[PDB]
Amino acid sequence: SHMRILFLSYRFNSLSQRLYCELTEREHEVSVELDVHPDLTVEAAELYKPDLIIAPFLKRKIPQEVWKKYKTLIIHPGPPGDRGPNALDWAIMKGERIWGVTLLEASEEYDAGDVWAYRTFPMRFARKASIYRNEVTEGVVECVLEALENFERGDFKPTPQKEHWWNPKMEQELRRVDWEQDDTKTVLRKVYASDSQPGASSKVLGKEVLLFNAYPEEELKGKPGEVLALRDEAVCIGTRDGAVWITHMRERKKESIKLPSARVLGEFLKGVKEDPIKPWEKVDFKTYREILYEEEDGIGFIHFNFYNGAMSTEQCYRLLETIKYAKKRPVKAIVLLGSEDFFSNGMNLNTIENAESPADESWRNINAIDDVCEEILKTPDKLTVAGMQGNAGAGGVFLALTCDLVFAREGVVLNPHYKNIGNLYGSEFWTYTLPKRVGWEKGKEVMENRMPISSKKAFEIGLIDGVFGKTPKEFRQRLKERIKNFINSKDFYEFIEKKKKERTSGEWLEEIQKCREHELEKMKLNFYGFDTSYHIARYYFVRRKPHFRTPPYLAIHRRLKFSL
Ligand SMILES: CC(C)(COP(=O)(O)OP(=O)(O)OC[C@H]1O[C@@H](n2cnc3c(N)ncnc32)[C@H](O)[C@@H]1OP(=O)(O)O)[C@@H](O)C(=O)NCCC(=O)NCCS
């Protein structure tokens, strides 16, 4: 059973990439056609002639010519019977306690097809994107694997829908936050239902904005709509009964991009006071903590909740400050945990795109990331560990590899390459860490592969040291147990005595300095050289520019030597 499977995806998004890894690592072939136009979708099917079509992320209706000829299954992010384009938005706005995902056949009527598989799950009070990347994605994987087994068996019949309901596209009027009428729980519900797109509209300091990444505040109080404080570029705003933090906003304009709230509001905030809390402080009320440092059982854990895993220059230096603090503490190990949804996606391309000089801001940002990496590497007397609870891409992968040990949750998707951002050389000391893990020949192959790999595949090729756990919480518990056991063994003390000798030696310090110098000379060429492919790629990415064809790295059926 080696199936030829065509994906129909609006973008090759997180769910599409996860399914690509699950199917190809089971020796199926997956070609992708991006959802650009029905004419191109029909052509892709006739070119590739798939055994099965899966649509992980659909914007347009699939043409009848296609799904009447090829068995075509659609992912719907609601339980059986739920129909409509905004299933998760409604489940969050209505406060559903149970939700689910359905794999159904394409049909003439919208979302009316017979059910191949479904999964249900309890809802969290959390952003839509977090539900999509965790509960929905895990359930969809189980559905698709079940359906492939059923498809190959050959006598399967799907289950017609019985009860069903329709929810239309959700209008912004429903999402709009009114500070005087809305209590904190209502503001959170609206922002969660609209994050990461399209955003919940509001007015803040007279500016029409879209709100993203909200957190409740229990200490600061004021008038509704009043800005109460700034913290790490997030703003705290009074609600009907309390206050909420908004970390990111977008102006309500076609060309504007998502940015830290302080950068969107700008001079309108003049006079607001910063209300800082250090990551290592303890507080007994709910508040916004971008970076959190906690110690348990001789292990110092650093959580860094950078929105979308994107690490701005200033976020990197706040992470650096926390790592330096941890290195002065009486812990045996330091664990970098990222956030539940992302370990890291490297430099923050949005704050780079927004800068007066994107090239200069890129230079600032890569030097700040390398300072984090260098601080991690130069830790002679403590174990360092990267715990990847969620996805990582580009420099975010190589940030993890600077740690002594890298572990990841099952189902994490890695993109250890720069092919989507103009072929940057990369830094983060990859020219030291990567050959140490996989060898030079394999390391070059890894960085030449533009397709994603799972954490299981990363473990199998030696890129990371272990993979375990199904949820972020299970992964964190198992990681803590594994590290606790290690640091309480004689093996740890022998390892640290070796590490102390290696990492204070002149030869090693010269080696990693030469690695940083060489990588940054190449990145300087990427950022400032006459060839501006990096800047063009960043613009297309950050501005979400549309596609007019599917590139052959995705579309096997559009490659030069393709036939049959
Ligand atoms: C890693 C990657 C392939 C994952 O693809 P994916 O699973 O489909 O996830 P998405 O592209 O949808 O990312 C989710 C969100 O994070 C944003 N994002 C991801 N990486 C980002 C980055 N480095 N900077 C700014 N935003 C980033 C995306 O724009 C998207 O934003 P939105 O939901 O608010 O609209 C893709 O996000 C990517 O190429 N990121 C850039 C990594 C990079 O090039 N960094 C700079 C060089 S170090």
Residue numbers in the entry: -1 to 562
Question: What did the article's authors report about this structure?
Answer:
We obtained diffraction-quality crystals of HypX with two different space groups (C2221 and P41212 for Forms I and II, respectively) under crystallization conditions as described in Methods. Their crystal structures were determined at a resolution of 1.80 and 2.40 Å for Forms I and II, respectively. The Form I and Form II crystals contain two molecules (chains A and B) and one molecule of HypX in their asymmetric units, respectively. The unidentified electron density was observed inside the cavity both in the Forms I and II crystals, indicating some molecule is present there. Based on the results of MS analyses and the shape of the electron density, we assumed the molecule bound in the cavity to be CoA, whose molecular weight is 767, and found that it was the case. The occupancy and B-factor of CoA were 1.0 and 27.0 Å2, respectively. As we did not add CoA during the purification and crystallization of HypX, it was thought to be bound to HypX in E. coli cells. There are Tyr416 and Glu426 near the SH group of CoA adopting the folded conformation, which are candidates for a general base responsible for decarbonylation of formyl-CoA.
The crystallographic analyses reveal that HypX consists of the N- and C-terminal domains that are structurally homologous to the hydrolase domain of FDH and enoyl-CoA hydratase/isomerase (ECH/ECI), respectively. HypX will catalyze two consecutive reactions, the formyl-group transfer from N10-formyl-THF to CoA and decarbonylation of formyl-CoA, in the N- and C-terminal domains, respectively, to produce CO. The putative catalytic residues, His74, Asp80, and Asp109 in the N-terminal domain and Ty416 and Glu426 in the C-terminal domain, are perfectly conserved among HypX homologs listed in the previous report. CoA is constitutively bound in HypX, which will act as the prosthetic group for CO biosynthesis through the formation and the decarbonylation of formyl-CoA. CO produced by HypX is used as a ligand of the iron in the NiFe(CN)2(CO) center of NiFe hydrogenases.
